[model samples]
Target chain A: QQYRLDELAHLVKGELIGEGSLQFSNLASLENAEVNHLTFVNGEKHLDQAKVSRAGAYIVTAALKEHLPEKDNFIIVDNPYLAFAILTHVFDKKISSTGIESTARIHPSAVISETAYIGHYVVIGENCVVGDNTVIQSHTKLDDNVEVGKDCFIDSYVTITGSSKLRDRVRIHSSTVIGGEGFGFAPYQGKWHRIAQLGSVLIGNDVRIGSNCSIDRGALDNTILEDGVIIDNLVQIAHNVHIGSNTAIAAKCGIAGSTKIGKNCILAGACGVAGHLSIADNVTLTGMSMVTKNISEAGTYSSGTGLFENNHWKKTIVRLRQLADVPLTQITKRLDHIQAQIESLESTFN
Target chain B: VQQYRLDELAHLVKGELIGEGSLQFSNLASLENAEVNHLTFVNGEKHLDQAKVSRAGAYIVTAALKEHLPEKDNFIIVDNPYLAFAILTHVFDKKISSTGIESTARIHPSAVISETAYIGHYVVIGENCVVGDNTVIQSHTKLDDNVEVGKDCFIDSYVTITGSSKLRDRVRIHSSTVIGGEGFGFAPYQGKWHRIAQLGSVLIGNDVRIGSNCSIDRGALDNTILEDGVIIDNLVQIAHNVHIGSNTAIAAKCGIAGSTKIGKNCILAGACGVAGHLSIADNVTLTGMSMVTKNISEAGTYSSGTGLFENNHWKKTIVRLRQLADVPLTQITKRLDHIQAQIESLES
Candidate 1:
């Protein structure tokens, strides 16, 4: 896994400022980089660490060139972070899987491509289709009518219920449930009547869903995630929701039923959006914000008070509650009385 | 499910029946949704109208609501209609059969599974795990080494019960939940982040119902504990070392951060966030979206934030709130000066 300086520069389309013949064996962080390892500096805060690093070659932004050590063994790129992300895939180890395991309980009617790898105890139901070079890992269950496209990776212990479709290159991590029944009920005389969920989930290309997520099926219409959407762990996307393309939602966020989130949005950790709202494009929601209404604009929105020390927060909350108890009309009436007193005094002086 | 005579149901629920003794019913439903074969209940006068129009064959009613029954012969009078309803649910529930272990299940030789327990397809029970009587571990579920589950529990599919997690009797864990996952604890050292190993596991008590996709993390020192009869809803996050007292109900999407101690019989509504290491008193009711950032010393309902308004009004409010520190002080200072000058002239 060795690369010459010229080859690495050509791969990331960067200007090589060092000798082309220098060889690097692996990629590491600035602090851990040894001889023959390539490290990157993303910002000036890490420039001092990079100076002391023992790496043979470096990937740096144009502004960081002056902070590097005396040797010219570096590649200068406009975006070092993007280059690092690309280089991670280049250095990723190959996951090897040969012929299908004998313990897999694939249905006779299912269609699996010749290049697909089915691991131990994997169950494929009736009329399911696994496309070329896809890897279904151990203990995964794909129920009836599931269709997974080419080069997808379904990790261990995943459950994809009936009629769900995953497009090309989709990666679903461990223990995620797709196409499960949504939580929908109608109230009838103090008890609940369960409404049957009839629709499925449709996920688009290049989507990566993290571990332990629950993406429910719709009540009537299908729940949809457009291309390049990335969802982190512990997220709950409810019935009839539509998440637009390239929106990256962080961990522990719950979007209630029928909400529409626009493209290229960023929702931070532990945020909750109410049901049936429309969030506009490019909107950014900070951590732990509660959205009870629609977001129509594209700017960042926040709710809830910031984190406070325990004792100070107790006093402030009491004062906040006291402020709520005073009526606006009472304050207005007192102000009017004060104004009247001032007017009468001024008239007497005139 | 077997049908029960009205006289038998009256005896089971300890009610006095006025209905035909031989009439049989098999299911329980609400008054508005019940059919002729279903049994319903009227708890108070508010539900009497719905009960009178219901098609149910028999009714359970309290003494106060007995006078409102449409027909005298079709009702059973009880002290508590809600308790009668709960008893009837148990009577009408079908016993799920525990079929023997599936062929593909890999059980370690050191694990002890009860003869009456049901182990489903592709399940993996690791070393020294004990499964109690009549417990059912569903398909593709993994119990890592040294896990213990008590009697009559139902663990759903794809759930990972990690090492050393213990569940007591009648616990119900839904699909895709991770019990005893490593907590999100990291320490930043010289130019990098180092992981602090989570050494403790989870201890869930009897009759706990944890919903789907929730993550209950293992602790760094002591066990994260959910006491008896705690009910947690979907997508909730319980961080490491959190101890929730008995009979508390936490709604969906709530995140209780690490090491928090929540007292008994509290109701935390949907999407609430309670900060770490705070003590929440018993009988506290937190409204939806309430953020608890401090210790609660008394039992009462607490809330935060103004309700939703139009976007334009919301924008104005945000600006006005920002200007509040300066604007109100300036106006009050000017008014105070005016009053002082008037008093001085009067003195002169």
Candidate 2:
């Protein structure tokens, strides 16, 4: 799709600069932008790269106007990153379906909207509801009584069991299992008794769950994600976990059972939060940090030693272990003896 | 499931029975939850109180614990109660019969499947794939070219076993798991990421149980392998060329980076991350949320970091730690000398 620089600027509600009539074919990063591609400069750090970039046009903030060559074509926006995000949707080439596949095994009792596209081998169980313009991709199973809202994209090989419901426009990537059984057991004698997970998952609108995620059903209550929560790949949300709206959880993060993460929080990659804890809003956890308890205040909390060189880490760990076993009593006794010696020396000097 | 008499259970488990031979039980449970129709066990004195209060139809106990029982009408004397319990579970397990192949399945002409194996609807079996007898491949599962699955294996729905993956007998892969996905290997060249071709396969052994949503990558060179009885829980990531030893139980959300060799019988608890190319020794027990960054030469438990504290105290402690690291030994010694001199002058 080709767009004139003036048209693109008008679309994003930005002011067009030099060469407004120039056309662009696609969007790319600043470093890899081609002659026909459009790119954006989000920060001052990348301004130098943007100036030297070979792109035909750029979307820049007003402050970056002096940095660019005077003859270069550009669009001035308030937030270049937000403009880039908006343009991504315009340039996205994602496949959209118009009709249901013939091989889908939909139950007679299920209600599917006319415009919804059910892909190949999709199984919709009894009493299920598919809203208008929703796309349920291949091999997806919506178990009994499942409800999907309008314009949602449920990708291939996804299983939504135990009557879970997805709100409007939720996009779940491939191979994610929602409403699976929670890991709950009761220890009696020397064995484990399985406790039946009686609850389901309740996902909110406009949430994006990444590939290979496992969001378990609650033991007795619904596991919930509020609106606009975006999760990255391989994230595990355990039973009864409630994530607040607009929380962005990065890849490989595991929030254990009953943990409530507050709104607008950012959990970086590979972070693990313990069970039954509460994390306050706007909290940022760095990569690979372990949260063993509640976070009552909104701030950055980190744990675990940062990565070190292998040989140095080994020596440091040795010192750390020794520090754990150090006896404080012996040191106190030595200090007392030194004080007594000082007193004796003073008496002698006097 | 067939109900077994108390004497029959004793004979099957190679134990002596003191209970009435006519007493029948069809289910197994723990002492506290066991009903009159369920069989329970008392392993030691710790379970004696539970045993006394249990209303189970029968109990399995050792000779040492049998003395606590007042009567012999409902007890089976076994050397190992836990082993007997495991045996009873096998006896009581309901085996699902194969439903044969569904009509909607797409099998290539070169693919060979045993007559007894069950292939569900919409399954796509690629060329030269071989499925053994009594194996069950569920709906919407994809088996790429040249993949071989051994007998009595259970591959759940929506799973993708890529080309060259070999699964041995009784291996159970849960739903939505991706076996033999290309490894996360890339090289930075000329400011762009170049994809490295993954030419290796995945080899899984007998009785291996991989839980749901796991991503086991195909190797870059040698095959990624899970030895016998290796059980992995949900959402675990086993990177390329990683070899997991026999009987190792890795809990949920554990990520083992590429080329890591996890030893036999090791227990990696929930959410632990092990660095790449590391060797973990046999019987190494890593606690929950532990970050393993080095090789272990011995079998022992290792941990890191101080436990959770109040955020205010944590901030102060962090400051103190920075101060501790910043203070020089010479300055500390000089401060000690000055304090000593002040004390001596005061005494004078």
Query: What CAPRI class is candidate 1?
Result: incorrect
Model 2 misplaced stretches (Cα beyond 4 Å): A327-350, B1-331, B337-348
Question: Per-prediction DockQ scores?
Answer: 0.09, 0.09
At residue A216, give the lDDT of candidate 2.
Answer: 95
lDDT of 1 by residue, A194-285 (tens): 99999999999978786688899889878999987887668889999999987877668889999999988888768889999999998998
What does candidate 1's lDDT look like per residue over B83-167, in tens digits?
9989889888865675679987988899999999999988888788999999999988888778999999999888888737999
TM-score: model 1, chain A = 0.93
Residue B129 error, candidate 2, Å: 21
Q: List, residue by residue over B1-348, the lDDT tens digit for candidate 2.
A: 468888888888898877588878878888899889889898879888888888888988888888887853577788889999888888777655656899999788999999999999889787789999999998889887779999999998888787379999999999988898656544332322233345568999999999998888777545899999999999888888899999999999888878899999999889778878899999988777777777987887765445555677566555545544544535546757876767666742
| iRMSD for every model | 8.8, 9.9
Tens-digit lDDT string for candidate 2 (A268-309): 668889999999998999768879878999998876875343
Model 2 residue B154 distance off true place after TM-score fit, in angstroms:
19
Worst 10 residues of 2 chain B by lDDT: B187-196
TM-score of chain B of each: 0.87, 0.83
